[PDB]
Each structure stands twice: as C-alpha cells, then as structure tokens.
Amino acid sequence: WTPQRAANRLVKVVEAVSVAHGIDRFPVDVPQLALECAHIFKWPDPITKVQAAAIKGFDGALFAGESRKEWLLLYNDAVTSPGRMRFTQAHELGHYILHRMQRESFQCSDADMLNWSQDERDIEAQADLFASYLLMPLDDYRKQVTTDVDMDILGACAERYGVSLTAAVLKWLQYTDEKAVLVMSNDGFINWAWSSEPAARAGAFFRTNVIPLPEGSLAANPEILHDRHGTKIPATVWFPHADPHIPLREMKIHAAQYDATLSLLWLPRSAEVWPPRE
Ligand SMILES: [Zn+2]
C-alpha cells in the first residue's frame, strides 16, 4: 500500500458511512476508521483501542500488543488542539496501514507531524502524506481555494477539515501552481520552511540550522501581530537574488496551535530567485 492508495480507499469509506448516517463527511472521524481499519483492509490484527492521554515528549503512538495480535493508538490531548489531535490520529493510522510490519511500535513528535515531504523512505513524511490525503481529499479541498489565497481562506479550510492552520497551508502548498513558501519561526528565528513545487523549482526554498528572520520582514517585527491578506514588499527582502523590482506578498499570523509565527510568502508566477550562474 501507498499513502495515496490507502487514503483513497478510506475516503470512500468516509463517504459511504457519512451518507448512511446522514451526516457531514468532514471533519473525518479518525477513531471510527482506525477501529474498522483491519476489516477494511482484510487483516487479522486490528487497532482495538484509540485512547487520549497526556503525553510528554511526543504527540502520538502506535503500540503492538502481546504477540502483535492487536494495536493501541495513543494520542496526546494535553496542551494541544482538536486539529492537532485529528492529524496525529490519522498519522498513526498511516503507520498502521503502511509501516507496521517494520517495527513493534511508533512514537511520533510534533516535528514528525510537520515533516511533510515526498521522500518515500521517510516513514514520518509518508504517514503525514497519508494523513493529508485522508483528512483533506484534494477533490474537495480544491473547491475551497478558488479566486484568492490568504490566511482567512486557509483558516476556513482548517476549520472545515478539522486540522491545524499549518496543516491546511501545507496541503495548499502540496498542490498549488502558485509560487509560495511557508516559514514557521519562534522568537525571531526560522525553524521550518516549506515551498510549493513551483517555488522550489524557482529556487525559493530554505533548508533548515536556526537562522534569523530578515530584518525588514513583517515577520521580524514583534509589533505586527498579524497580516492575514499580505503586504506587498520587495522579494529581495526574503530572496536576495530576485530581480530588484519583483514584489512579494508577506502574510503573518500567530499559530496558536503551535505557539509560533507563520509567514506565508507569495511570489509572482514568473519569479526566479536562483543565484547567478558563476
Ligand atoms: Zn510517525
């Protein structure tokens, strides 16, 4: 099984069960799927318990029982949010479907839940991709982002799918044809960055080292608490090799669910920011 094929099957289950009950599909009820997952995939070793706990040091876990005949899905419910809990549950369900023959257990941190990538050998990234496909099926998500993008629109996605704002933005970056970069920072320093595919192709990405924010950015000003629609500034503030007249829109919002600052940078479709070829 792959993240996309496994999620596709479970999205069909969600659709069918929601219709049968006469209820909304979203947000997805992950515990219900987890308890049915062995039946849905025709396996003998089910998840038999999905349990909230106050967990220190990680956010979710999947533990094989004695003789690997049943599995326990534990998720943190302390100092978190419903959207983080739902994503953690889906992430652990991803390990159950995709990875459980590799290990006796999985214990997964908030960082694991933010590490979305397309590297198929990174099991944390693969569980994140699974969770993104299950919780935010693209057919439906695309209908939520049409004529404009801003933190209000992406916040509405987060509410609709029952995920964090960060997860809703990452989903958009996963598929958009726009050139955009999300930067998560704390106390003036960049901790994570993620680029849309067009941005990455154009050189607009940051490898993460703890690196200060640009001194002229909206992000770096503690006084600016939020800018949900995005102020137009020179692209060179963030991407020094951009041509000097290229603008960028910089959005800013406090990520309550992660207690950090999110900066969403939106570049023109034509922008290229690679350095000169020496
Ligand atoms: Zn994990």
Residue 262 in contact with residue 252, Cβ under 8 Å? yes
What's 276's DSSP letter? P
Nearest to 28 by CA among 127, 121, 161, 158: 161
Whether 241 and 222 have beta carbons less than 8 Å apart is answered as: no
Q: What is the DSSP string of 31-75?
A: HHHHHHHHHHHT-SS-EEEEEEE--SS-SEEEEE-GGGS-EEEEE
Residue 152 CA, ligand 1 centroid: distance in Å: 29
- Tell me how far apart the alpha carbons of residues 149 and 45 are, in angstroms, rounded to a whole number: 43
Residue 36 Cα, ligand 1 centroid: separation in angstroms?
20
Q: Which residues contact 65 (CB under 8 A, 6 or more apart)?
A: 48, 71, 72
Helices 82-99, 123-135: crossing angle, 10 deg rounding:
120
* Preceding peptide of 27 cis, ω within 30°: yes
Name the amino acid, one letter, at 161: Y
Experimental method for this entry? X-ray
Q: Is 124 annotated as a binding residue?
A: yes
For 275, which DSSP code? P
CA of 99 to the centre of ligand 1 (A): 10
**Taking a C-beta distance cutoff of 8 angstroms, is the pair 179, 205 a contact?**
no
Ligand 1 centroid, distance to 95 Cα (angstroms): 7
Label the pairing between strands 189-195 and 179-186. Answer: antiparallel
What separation in Å is there between the alpha carbon of 141 and the centre of ligand 1? 24
Tell which residue, 27, 83, 66, 72, has the closest CA to residue 46.
Answer: 72
Residue 37 among known ligand-binding residues: no
Q: How far, in Å, is the centroid of ligand 1 from the Cα of 104?
A: 13
Burial of 102 (0-12, 13-18, 19+ CB in 10 A): exposed
Q: Determine phi and psi for 165, rounding to 5 degrees.
A: -60, -45
**Ligand 1 center from residue 109 Cα (angstroms):** 7
Strand (E) positions, 77-147? 105-108
Q: Is 157 annotated as a binding residue?
A: no
| Burial grade of 29 (CB within 10 A; 0-12, 13-18, 19 or more) | middle
